Symmetry: C3
Subunit: 336 residues, 3 copies
Amino acid sequence: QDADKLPHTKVTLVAPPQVHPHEQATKSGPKVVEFTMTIEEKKMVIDDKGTTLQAMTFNGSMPGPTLVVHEGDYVQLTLVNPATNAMPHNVNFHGATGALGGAKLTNVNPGEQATLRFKADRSGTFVYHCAPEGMVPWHVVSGMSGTLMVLPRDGLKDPQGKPLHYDRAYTIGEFDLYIPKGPDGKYKDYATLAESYGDTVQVMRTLTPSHIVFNGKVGALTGANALTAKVGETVLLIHSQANRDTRPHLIGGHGDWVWETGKFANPPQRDLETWFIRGGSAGAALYTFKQPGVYAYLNHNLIEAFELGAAGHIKVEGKWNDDLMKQIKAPAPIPR
Amino acid sequence: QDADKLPHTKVTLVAPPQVHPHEQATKSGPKVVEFTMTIEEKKMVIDDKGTTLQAMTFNGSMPGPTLVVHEGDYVQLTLVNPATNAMPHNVNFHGATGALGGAKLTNVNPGEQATLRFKADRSGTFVYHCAPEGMVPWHVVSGMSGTLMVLPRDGLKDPQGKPLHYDRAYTIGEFDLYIPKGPDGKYKDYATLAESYGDTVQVMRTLTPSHIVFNGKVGALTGANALTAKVGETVLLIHSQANRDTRPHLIGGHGDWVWETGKFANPPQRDLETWFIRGGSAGAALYTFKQPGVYAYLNHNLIEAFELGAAGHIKVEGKWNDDLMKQIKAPAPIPR
Amino acid sequence: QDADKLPHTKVTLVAPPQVHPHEQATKSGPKVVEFTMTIEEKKMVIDDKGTTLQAMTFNGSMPGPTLVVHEGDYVQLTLVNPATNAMPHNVNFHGATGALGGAKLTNVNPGEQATLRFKADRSGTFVYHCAPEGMVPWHVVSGMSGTLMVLPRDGLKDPQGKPLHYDRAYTIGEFDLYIPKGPDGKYKDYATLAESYGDTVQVMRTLTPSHIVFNGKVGALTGANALTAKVGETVLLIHSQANRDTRPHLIGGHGDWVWETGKFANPPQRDLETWFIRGGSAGAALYTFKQPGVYAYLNHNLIEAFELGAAGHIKVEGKWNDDLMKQIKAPAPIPR
Ligand SMILES: [Cu+2]
Ligand SMILES: [Cu+2]
Ligand SMILES: [Cu+2]
Ligand SMILES: [Cu+2]
Ligand SMILES: [Cu+2]
Ligand SMILES: [Cu+2]
Ligand SMILES: [Zn+2]
Ligand SMILES: [Zn+2]
Ligand SMILES: [Zn+2]
Ligand SMILES: [Zn+2]
Ligand SMILES: [Zn+2]
Ligand SMILES: [Zn+2]
Ligand SMILES: [Zn+2]
Ligand SMILES: [Zn+2]
Ligand SMILES: [Zn+2]
């Protein structure tokens, strides 16, 4: 429990919506778990009308990858800011204690890197996000956030202490975007990141997003990119929102056990239709599929989901169960 | 527990704010409970300035009627869409499992009907709402939603398992409306439902409602239409909001026991001043009146309540209790 | 427990962010606790650009002072409205039962005073606010609200019934302000309170605040006015928001035990990153500092905090703990 004397392990991160391989309950003692992330500023196409965002990311994606450790472990992150970027960046882990979540110890200009270590002494899903002095909201709404999941060493439990397991974990980052429009009513397109700043701050101040998207763009988690599962399988759905409130809902399903405030030492609530993720936090829900078909997983402000983008799909294979639901009479002429 | 072999019972629905007669705790075994609803598109006057809404409803009201069953029962709904309507409709029960809550099995064009059955295996208050492919938010904000209440077979309980009862139940549906204005600054009035569409979607995208009303219009639950009760009586207040968050509060009273996320297998919280109903959900509060007089029951964003409409009244008869509250000195000149 | 036969004690109130001296657990039996407050309408400078607010306050401050009693006690408030004010006022205690929280018994015109007594029979942090018939939202968003804290007679407890203590309590009132602008794009400045009314109601109806501030102005709880503490000290952070939702977060810290709905007979949640205060309520969090340095305490809609004002600082003295957090490698050139 002096970290300098514990065993170290290096973890290879994977892009959302997947989550790197990890153990739930573990017999291992505490470890220093080492991760590396490289910041990439890049222009991204965020809708099907050609709208672009002068975006800023951890590891090339929105959200950044999910990092998974166990309660008692130490997180050790090397943060790299290449010389091909234009702005300075840093990282604030909501799961850490002190120095503005680590931000004060990780201020890196383009061409620099830094390494931070902190004790992950609290279980739960926590946001991590960039927070450079003087430009915090701009870096966060441009894409710089992701989740740290700290699992209890004994794995997740229900309100009575019974063991809960998941077969697969998915991570969904929800981003309220503020794209400026010009006097012709079209969204603006900037040559550089610094040029989008002033216009973007004015839109931010109205508190009305132009778009609200899951994982970087409208329909990101649809079509070939839909989430997948099978009847009988239990999924863990991690949902982060670093700037604004959201209310997740699984259409045709439920939140079997949900930690909406995302902290695993608290008992979960069961049978939720819709849950609430406070801006500045990550929460987690378990669901075991009982019916096959296409589900929608969305923010249940329905204008925010269908008009502004905050909706994805989960394609589930398996056998239909008529005891749970059955069409008694299909659509047909009204008896006259 | 094969539904095809259980006894069937037909229930006659009643308009909000009342709730059809039903048992709380019951000794009956599971049943297939049959209900019928007819969709009615209609223009409604929603304020005291003559503003109209091209509205869409279940059974002629906003919200639609509350359907009440017990955990373990099956809900069997016949959904009718008359030929006098212009749009196609369907129904998504958040209390059901599979096929987009039943929406995929109930798509009815004008002149058609369908019958769906599902197992009500989770206790709580759940939203049901229309959700036609391509126009989901418009149908919901135009009035198509209501609540399904699934009671535990043993009735409601407190955190310690003690029995809780209500003498009367009221259902309140809260609707964020997006009425378009023309270039003269007045709200528009349309000859048909289809003509209001495009203008309405543009207002919806601003995320700013023009009006927010309880049960179909400003002041719906006031005057001759105020809710009523007596000192000593315990009321159940069901509150649904299918699209946007709300925060109910009883002025002069409290939420004695509240399930804000609306799911009865979870323990309730006590003594709440103000609770929170996530958009896309229904929640429930119990209160036993201890003082007579006129109470206000409202959304405690006070601009939303007093300026935009989200407020009602409860008139309570009985005896004033000076031990709970007493005027020591009435308003009078300040001692000089 | 007839209040007319209990001992009376008078309490001297202190300005926010401090809270008057009081006992947590007490051996005393119930008391009638007497307080006095004087309303002061005044113009206030609310930002660093000279913007003014035609404000309305309890006791000269935003928020008004926090009143602290114990469960079972009676609150007896004398409310004074001097003749130098222009409007009528009253008080609604969310902690009281009946007569619109006391508002119906305390309507005082300029030149009048009144005295109300009520039983504080429910533990928790509760909002109190002004609510004059016909102008409720305007008086509340102009500054008339504060908190009543009713402590359990045995002091605060955790979910298992273990005793929890605080060494110091701070009270933070968060105010969504709606300052009108004129046709030249500058904020308006009014000669009198009544002149600001009509313009202000039009801004309120957009539901978009111009500014969101802690304790009366942008940066109120910064610089010489930062909150203070030491490593090892446990602080109680009371947060009220009488009109609009907010989501408090301590940067570099956590909510060790939090009652977000603010009612102490309910078990608290632990390890929160960010909590939620519903508009129309007050909530409370405990935190024991483990690291020295400057923390930010803010609403984690980051545009609301950094662009609109809802952020303060806590300066903490003590010794840095490298086991909780350590810079392994400071910012330096990337290895080529
Ligand atoms: Cu950054
Ligand atoms: Cu943060
Ligand atoms: Cu419809
Ligand atoms: Cu829905
Ligand atoms: Cu007032
Ligand atoms: Cu109030
Ligand atoms: Zn080592
Ligand atoms: Zn580990
Ligand atoms: Zn499994
Ligand atoms: Zn049958
Ligand atoms: Zn039944
Ligand atoms: Zn009763
Ligand atoms: Zn006395
Ligand atoms: Zn006392
Ligand atoms: Zn202490």
